[PDB]
Amino acid sequence: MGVIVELIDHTSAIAAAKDRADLVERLRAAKARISDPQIRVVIAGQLKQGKSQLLNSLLNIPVARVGDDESTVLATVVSYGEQASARLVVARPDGAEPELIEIPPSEVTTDLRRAPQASGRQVLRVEVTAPSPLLKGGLAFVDTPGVGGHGQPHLSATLGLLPDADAMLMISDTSQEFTEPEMKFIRQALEICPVAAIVATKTDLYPHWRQIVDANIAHLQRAGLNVPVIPASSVLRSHAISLNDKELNEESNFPAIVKFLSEHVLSRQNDRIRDQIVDEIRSAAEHLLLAVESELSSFNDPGERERLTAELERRKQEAQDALQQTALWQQVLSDGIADLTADVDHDLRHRFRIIAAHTEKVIDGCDPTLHWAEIGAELEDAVATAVGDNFVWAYQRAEALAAEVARTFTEAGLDAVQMPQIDYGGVLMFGMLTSFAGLGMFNPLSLGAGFVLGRKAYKEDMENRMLRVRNEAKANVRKFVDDVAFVVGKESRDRLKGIQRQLRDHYREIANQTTRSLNESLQAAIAAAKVEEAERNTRVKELERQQNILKQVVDHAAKLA
Ligand SMILES: Nc1nc2c(ncn2[C@@H]2O[C@H](COP(=O)(O)OP(=O)(O)OP(=O)(O)O)[C@@H](O)[C@H]2O)c(=O)[nH]1
Ligand SMILES: [Mg+2]
Numbered sequence: 001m002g003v004i005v006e007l008i009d010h011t012s013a014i015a016a017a018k019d020r021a022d023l024v025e026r027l028r029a030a031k032a033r034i035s036d037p038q039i040r041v042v043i044a045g046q047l048k049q050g051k052s053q054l055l056n057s058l059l060n061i062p063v064a065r066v067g068d069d070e071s072t073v074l075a076t077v078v079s080y081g082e083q084a085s086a087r088l089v090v091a092r093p094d095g096a097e098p099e100l101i102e103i104p105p106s107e108v109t110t111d112l113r114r115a116p117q118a119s120g121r122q123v124l125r126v127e128v129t130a131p132s133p134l135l136k137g138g139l140a141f142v143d144t145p146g147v148g149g150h151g152q153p154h155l156s157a158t159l160g161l162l163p164d165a166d167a168m169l170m171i172s173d174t175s176q177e178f179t180e181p182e183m184k185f186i187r188q189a190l191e192i193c194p195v196a197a198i199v200a201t202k203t204d205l206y207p208h209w210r211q212i213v214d215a216n217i218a219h220l221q222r223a224g225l226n227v228p229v230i231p232a233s234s235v236l237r238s239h240a241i242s243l244n245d246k247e248l249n250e251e252s253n254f255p256a257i258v259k260f261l262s263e264h265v266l267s268r269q270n271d272r273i274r275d276q277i278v279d280e281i282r283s284a285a286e287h288l289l290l291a292v293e294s295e296l297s298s299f300n301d302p303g304e305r306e307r308l309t310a311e312l313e314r315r316k317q318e319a320q321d322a323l324q325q326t327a328l329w330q331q332v333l334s335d336g337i338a339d340l341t342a343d344v345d346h347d348l349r350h351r352f353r354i355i356a357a358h359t360e361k362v363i364d365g366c367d368p369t370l371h372w373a374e375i376g377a378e379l380e381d382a383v384a385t386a387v388g389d390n391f392v393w394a395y396q397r398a399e400a401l402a403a404e405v406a407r408t409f410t411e412a413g414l415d416a417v418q419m420p421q422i423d424y425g426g427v428l429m430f431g432m433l434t435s436f437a438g439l440g441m442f443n444p445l446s447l448g449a450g451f452v453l454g455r456k457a458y459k460e461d462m463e464n465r466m467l468r469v470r471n472e473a474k475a476n477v478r479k480f481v482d483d484v485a486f487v488v489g490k491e492s493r494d495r496l497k498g499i500q501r502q503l504r505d506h507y508r509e510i511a512n513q514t515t516r517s518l519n520e521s522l523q524a525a526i527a528a529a530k531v532e533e534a535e536r537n538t539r540v541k542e543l544e545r546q547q548n549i550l551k552q553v554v555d556h557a558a559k560l561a
Contacts, residue, residue, distance in 0.1 A: 011553055014285075023284045026513070030281075032425075033276075036079070036138065037270075038079060040142055040167075041165065041261070042168045043055060043142060044185070045155075045172055046149070047149045051072070052071055054169075054201060055078065059130060059134050060241045064143050073113055074145055075125035075142060075144055075432055076128060078135065078140065078141045079127070079130075080129065080132065080135030082131055085105060087103060088100070088117060091122040096497075097498075100427055103117060108126060122431075144158050151438040153433070154381070154385075155182070155384075156184075156384050156385060167193065167197075168195070168196040170197070171201055173200070173201045174208075188391075192392060197264075198229040200213050200216065201232055204236050217229050228260065230253065230260060237249065286418075289547065290417045290418075290520075291523075294522070297525070298528035316518040316522060322511040328408055328412065329409040333405045333503055337496050341493055341496050348488060348492075349485055352386060355379070355383060359379050363470050367469075368445065375473070376443055379444075380440070383435065383436070394495075414514055417514065429495065433488075433491065434491055436483075436484055436487075444477060
């Protein structure tokens with residue numbers, strides 16, 4: 001920058017001179033954030049819709065893997081970097097911060113789900129760099145693994161990437177209209193990530209692609225889902241790039257994708273980042289100002305020292321009490337997380353109980369041996385959709401809790417550094433959700449049911465046989481549902497522990513910072529009473545000089561509104 005970065009540098013210099021290492025680090029993080037913002041755009045959709053090819057054609061770089069049956073098996077984040085680099089994001093137990101493990105940039109195009117460096121631990125995602133001018137602005141794309149197919153996770157598993165995302169591109173090729181799972185996922189996704197667009201891919205392959213697009217637009221409007229649809233051909237885009245052909249690039253309609261990313265993602269988020277760094281600059285300056293103006297008050301107004309110091313002492317004590325387990329904001333957080341953990345599990349099992357009841361009715365209303373595949377498919381879809389709805393519900397409740405904790409902290413004045421009256425930078429935990437082992441892998445009928453070797457010399461009456469087969473199917477359904485509830489509940493629990501950790505770290509950092517700034521102000525006010533009058537004006541002038549420089553930073557920051 002000219003202005004903003006200078007302002008950060010300028011403020012950091014003042015903080016360094018005042019031995020405020022905490023402020024220096026805070027400003028270091030803020031500056032790093034505005035350079036590498038990581039504005040994440042999740043590329044979602046079912047398998048083989050053209051997600052990876054879209055990403056490759058866009059950046060004109062083969063970071064994604066594209067094959068006719070294989071390719072993406074792990075969530076992959078692509079961000080800007082002049083030099084190629086890559087790392088695994090490997091999970092730690094009990095919602096602890098994930099571990100970054102450097103790998104050679106190649107290993108990507110391999111199955112990294114069992115990368116040797118991970119030591120059998122869960123790989124949440126892969127984060128790779130690419131030197132694409134497109135990413136220069138701070139856009140980061142998340143390619144998603146194949147879902148919706150046999151042996152794969154359900155499309156709703158993609159929802160786990162969205163709480164930490166700023167935008168979503170929903171990929172569906174123009175071979176046919178939206179399926180019901182696609183429609184359900186879109187509705188769920190918009191609850192978490194409102195900024196989204198449909199990319200209707202492979203227009204070069206399907207002559208009637210416009211028919212599908214218009215039918216999809218109609219369907220979206222009937223469902224009350226406000227998402228734009230953008231037609232595109234990655235294939236045309238790729239030739240356009242090769243030929244440096246502006247006209248062919250227009251035909252691929254990729255500029256429309258660029259336009260959406262620019263006007264609804266990059267520009268919008270750049271504004272929010274701009275606001276936060278300006279706020280970071282202002283806060284740092286105001287923390288420094290408190291000690292300066294407190295010492296000034298002690299000088300210019302000696303008869304007010306008792307009230308000034310008593311106030312500063314009071315606020316310091318409150319800031320210190322805020323670091324104790326008994327602090328109200330921490331109580332609200334801890335009790336809130338505990339309640340939500342139980343409530344999320346209660347919600348899930350309620351949804352599952354309703355689903356199990358429906359499936360059992362279906363089983364009792366037919367011949368299960370004539371519908372085992374159809375019954376299994378419906379159950380898996382219903383369960384996976386419920387997991388998705390549960391995840392959305394949990395996200396909304398977690399957001400509400402974080403808001404309440406924020407209010408509790410602020411209303412306690414634990415971030416206030418105004419003069420008394422006188423006269424997350426860590427590794428994120430986002431990844432694919434987990435429900436069942438894979439689609440089409442549950443069968444209500446088990447192997448050793450003995451239908452061939454169960455026949456006696458004499459025939460079983462049908463009534464009993466139906467009853468037995470139906471009871472067997474019900475048993476397997478209830479076990480499947482219970483097993484999923486166990487696995488999902490575990491992920492929910494660890495997720496909330498992670499959120500708890502992130503929020504706790506955040507506010508303890510603020511409390512320590514406030515404690516420090518108040519204690520410096522306190523010492524400054526005390527040390528001023530020790531100087532004889534002969535050195536008053538000399539120190540005072542220096543303070544007024546410091547005061548002006550800091551107020552200049554605040555004002556400069558304010559104008560950058
Ligand atoms: N004609 C045409 N074919 C495309 C286009 N985009 C992708 N394909 C083909 O469609 C298939 C799917 O490509 P991918 O980009 O790997 O799709 P995907 O969603 O990433 O697949 P998964 O990662 O397994 O979920 C590939 O074999 C491509 O050759 C396109 O724009 N036009
Ligand atoms: Mg792919």
